[PDB]
Design a protein around this ligand. Structure first.
Ligand code: HEM
Ligand code: HEM
Ligand SMILES: Cc1cc(N)nc(CCc2cncc(CCc3cc(C)cc(N)n3)c2)c1
Ligand SMILES: Cc1cc(N)nc(CCc2cncc(CCc3cc(C)cc(N)n3)c2)c1
Ligand SMILES: C[C@H](O)[C@H](O)[C@H]1CNc2nc(N)[nH]c(=O)c2N1
Ligand SMILES: C[C@H](O)[C@H](O)[C@H]1CNc2nc(N)[nH]c(=O)c2N1
Ligand SMILES: [Cl-]
Ligand SMILES: [Cl-]
Lengths: 362, 362
């Protein structure tokens, strides 16, 4: 019946995929082959065309992503051939280099071997391939609180962070058949970072803020036609509010709004002064300016929502229903200044798609 | 069976109301009386205590309101005695005067006779008792677009607006048995308005903006224990974002952000400059400053969310489940700077409550 779930998902995906690719006449023969393959082996293997179009459909179906206009130009790297930890490590280094593209970011996904019987072949422990460490030791908070748990697990395995506020975590992943994950320090030449400065306020550099160029999510499973690719990291470029309203501003993250208020010269004393809102706007302006100045791709939330509107129009023109999660699509600053705020969205789950999965620590 | 819906809602309300009022032993006798009264007359009449506590429960159950901490201090005015249009007009003038309270706003509801067999006794055409007119005549837009339809209906009945951007609409309501509503101009001495100025930027007054002091909603039905009070206007004080992010900023309302940008001296040319977000913050700061300076009650969205957090805590302490609509509770500026953004809310409908109802025009 697990086998039954597979065939049913398989029928649905192939029919849809081949219809979109102009190959509907080949559906019959392909499903035949697949049915025999499940019969004998307990699974089936995607063609390169299937896998590529499946990852692109999965992005197109991600209800929580404002960035979907560009779903059809996803760069897909097929690494179902990897068998060793060195090959996995090298494929991850490669994804970083090719996605970064000297700052002109290319949306990319690298796909590793799928689960076999719910049994992972490769288990990545990172939440993003590039992320900062976090520490908490009797009172003292250093770095990114969101990474405390993973940082502690790494330090169990013999790594030691320098305890700056921006230590890069090592890649950490376990292979099927190994008891402990291995880890590898990232080579700094592969990692672009951006110092945060403000276009008008010189003192803003006194805060000594920075962020990394490319968010490479490695904590989600790609599901395509009943095959579960648990290890399949993917990246876009940032929308500036993710850095300036959330990573740098949230009280449970870097918590910088009182420091931002002080450097832009406003009091942080009275709710009615709206100092938090003012500080959020100047911090977000600094983040966009800084990425643009350094030649690293980024989009502001107004341009992003306009692109998303085109995505909605495109879907209607193609006869496809649109699904979305309004609570994630609205940006955290000036949401009502976007068209998204003023309409509603059907939050149904459609596959192929990406699904969150929790880590072995945690 | 309509009679059956009534008794069932009646049983539920009395039991709950009397439990909260420490009167649970009187439930049996009261329900008995009520059952006979429905038997004979097709309905029942609330005691003054029931009606007052019911309106207060209905506020406490309004999922979309961030202001519910103060539900138990609602001022309830019982006007189930009115029979003429002059009495209705005078009760509405009175609500304005007593709610305004010289600027120290008192949350108030005036309750008129309920529907009898779905038959209204009094039908108020206004959406708020104080609101600005709107006009559109081949290209030319004047005043509040949200009021175009109602403004046109009034001008059918012989009223004529001066066609400023801030004409006050007349009260307009129909009585049972009359074919046409009547209308009455508001006396300006009852209506507080606030000129919008900025605490730091002198030029802001060049925009010649103003808003009215008190939002008095007259477009909703109060439902209490199966009795439908369609005419029951109620007011709070404003949260500043309602004026500055929505009434004055929205493209389909007064649409002032490009004018705000020009007067605060920033360019309105590039999405990445975040000029809309900057203009929204300065406009919202001006609205709070201006209401405070004039001595008219208002709350900022940060203080409001903190009060709402106390409302959540109070509900837990009392053993009551909390219901809310996250999509309306988050403020339209800096939503993620409030605790509301970071939790989830059960959007179930609980009665007594307030329910939207559409107008005869429209
Ligand atoms: C190309 C530029 C891209 C931008 C600007 C963009 C923007 C975003 C943003 C702003 C979010 C919400 C984050 C939050 O509010 O917490 C998000 C979520 C998401 N995006 Fe995109 N995205 C892009 C590319 C991609 C790509 C290439 C994929 C996959 C192939 C993807 C899949 C998703 C998914 C699955 C989520 C939900 C993540 C979760 O539940 O934790 N996005 N995106
Ligand atoms: C005392 C100060 C009050 C404040 C600051 C307040 C604040 C607000 C705000 C900000 C909204 C959302 C408006 C929007 O985003 O579109 C709202 C909605 C609402 N409030 Fe309150 N409120 C207060 C008092 C009251 C009172 C006294 C009642 C009734 C007795 C009430 C019942 C409601 C209802 C029913 C809605 C939903 C309206 C709709 O669906 O159109 N509120 N409130
Ligand atoms: C490809 C991509 C591009 C982009 N610009 N942003 C994103 C958003 C990434 C992102 C960053 N911080 C936090 C999250 C949420 C993490 C998260 C956590 C939990 C518990 C569940 C769940 N579904 N998701 C997501 C992804
Ligand atoms: C008592 C009260 C106090 C306060 N500070 N704000 C409010 C919000 C009033 C308000 C103002 N503009 C617009 C709306 C929404 C009107 C509205 C329209 C439709 C179609 C449905 C529906 N449920 N509601 C509500 C009410
Ligand atoms: C249904 C959809 O979410 C709709 O556009 C809502 C958005 N949330 C809202 N939130 C508030 N505060 N006021 C509104 O009028 C609306 N309309
Ligand atoms: C379930 C609840 O709405 C939750 O707090 C959400 C709020 N919406 C969100 N929106 C974004 N963009 N990112 C998040 O991580 C969350 N968490
Ligand atoms: Cl991030
Ligand atoms: Cl209003």
């Amino acid at each position: 019946e697990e086998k039954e779930i597979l065939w049913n998902e398989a029928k649905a995906f192939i029919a849809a995929c081949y219809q979109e690719l102009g190959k509907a006449a080949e559906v019959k023969d392909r499903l035949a082959d697949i049915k025999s393959e499940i019969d004998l082996t307990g699974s089936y293997v995607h063609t390169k065309e299937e896998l590529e179009h499946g990852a692109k459909m999965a992005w197109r179906n991600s209800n929580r992503c404002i960035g979907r206009l560009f779903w059809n130009s996803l760069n897909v790297i097929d690494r179902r051939d990897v068998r060793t930890k060195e090959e996995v490590r090298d494929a991850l280094f490669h994804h970083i280099e090719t996605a970064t593209n000297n700052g002109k970011i290319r949306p990319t996904i690298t796909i590793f071997p799928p689960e076999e019987k719910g049994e992972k072949q490769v288990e990545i422990w990172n939440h993003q391939l590039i992320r900062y460490a976090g520490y908490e030791s009797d009172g003292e908070r250093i770095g990114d609180p969101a990474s405390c748990s993973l940082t502690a697990a790494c330090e169990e395995l013999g790594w030691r962070g320098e305890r700056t506020d921006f230590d890069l975590l090592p890649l950490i992943f376990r292979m099927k058949g190994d008891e402990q994950p291995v880890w590898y320090e990232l080579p700094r030449s592969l990692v672009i970072e951006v110092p945060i400065t403000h276009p008008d306020i010189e003192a803003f550099s006194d805060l000594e803020l920075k962020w990394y160029g490319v968010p490479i999510i490695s904590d989600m499973k790609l599901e395509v036609g009943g095959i579960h690719y648990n290890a399949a990291p993917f990246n876009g470029w940032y929308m500036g509010t993710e850095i300036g309203a959330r990573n740098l501003a949230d009280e449970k993250r870097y918590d910088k709004l009182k420091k931002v208020a002080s450097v832009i010269g406003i009091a942080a004393d009275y709710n009615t002064d709206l100092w938090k809102d003012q500080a959020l706007v100047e911090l977000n302006k600094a983040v966009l300016h800084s990425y643009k100045k350094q030649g690293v791709s980024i989009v502001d939330h107004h341009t992003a929502a306009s692109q998303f509107k085109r995505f909605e129009e495109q879907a209607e023109e193609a006869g496809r229903k649109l699904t979305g999660d309004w609570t994630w699509l609205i940006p955290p600053i000036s949401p009502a200044a976007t068209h998204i705020f003023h309409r509603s969205y059907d939050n149904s789950i459609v596959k192929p798609n990406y699904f969150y999965q929790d880590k072995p620590y945690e």
